[PDB]
Amino acid sequence: SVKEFLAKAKEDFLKKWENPAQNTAHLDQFERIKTLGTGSFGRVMLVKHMETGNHYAMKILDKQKVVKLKQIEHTLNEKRILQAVNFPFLTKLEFSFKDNSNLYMVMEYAPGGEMFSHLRRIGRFSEPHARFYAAQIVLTFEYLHSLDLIYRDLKPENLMIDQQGYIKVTDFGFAKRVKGRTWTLCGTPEYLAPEIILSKGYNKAVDWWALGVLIYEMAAGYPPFFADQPIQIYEKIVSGKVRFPSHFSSDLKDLLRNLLQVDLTKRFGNLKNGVNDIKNHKWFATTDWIAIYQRKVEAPFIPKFKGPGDTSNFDDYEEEEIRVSINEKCGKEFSEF
């Protein structure tokens, strides 16, 4: 049973949520190889764990930059959640630690790169291609939401592809354990639900709206609401009007009208039947949900892979030192990390 699987998953989660792992490695245990990407207050690097020779991705956050961007509480949420969750399409936090300057989160390496990169290059995905990725997100949200977690950062840039062509969700900077409404304006303009834009209290329904944006973007090659400035994107999002490419199937269009639905009483994911409104929708009729979870479905795209720490599926980023001050920065703010 899904419900029973989730019951047990929650017991596993809560034990770790209530007693988080802390200080489980040190920078000197890793050989830094290549920057895999950047953010406003951090970077992710491919590293090699010396004692095992395993490769990992190491997210490095500058504590001073975290503070200036008012992301202290959000960063503590990310680490606390990531260390407690367990799901095939989430990257396990293997280790975490901090030093005078930085916060460090070490997770499994996904050599296939970002969906974003392949999506833009190839232009768009076929409906079966998009559906395969979509199903993994549906299952991942079903899992996270059952734990009272809201995700809030869904976009192709943050969907990593593994060696078998399956998805890894890795970035939990906006993820929050909340049973009620929440209010933080956060996420990516193109992916914001109307509720967020309108400064309402919102809940996990915003993730199901974001799923609609993602499926649209995956199948069209561009998002449903775009413009040159965020303000113009927000006006499109709130106006309540989406146009579909003529090549979209009738089932795809009907799924999207129900995900990209401004009315919360009608948005799929949000109703009485919850996630089953989505799973049992006609566009997903060919989906074997169990087979997707078990990773027995053949990925329609499987990545070029030459060696263990090969990075050809990632863009090239300027390499910058990892500097560690001789003074501890922001000790109190990050005490629990």
Partner: peptide, 20 residues
């Protein structure tokens, strides 16, 4: 075309999060 407008737009590259 809508694709042509997207490709010519300033938001085909990686999109940053907003923080408020």
């Amino acid at each position: 075309t809508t694709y042509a407008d997207f490709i010519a737009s300033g938001r085909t590259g990686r999109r940053n999060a907003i923080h408020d």
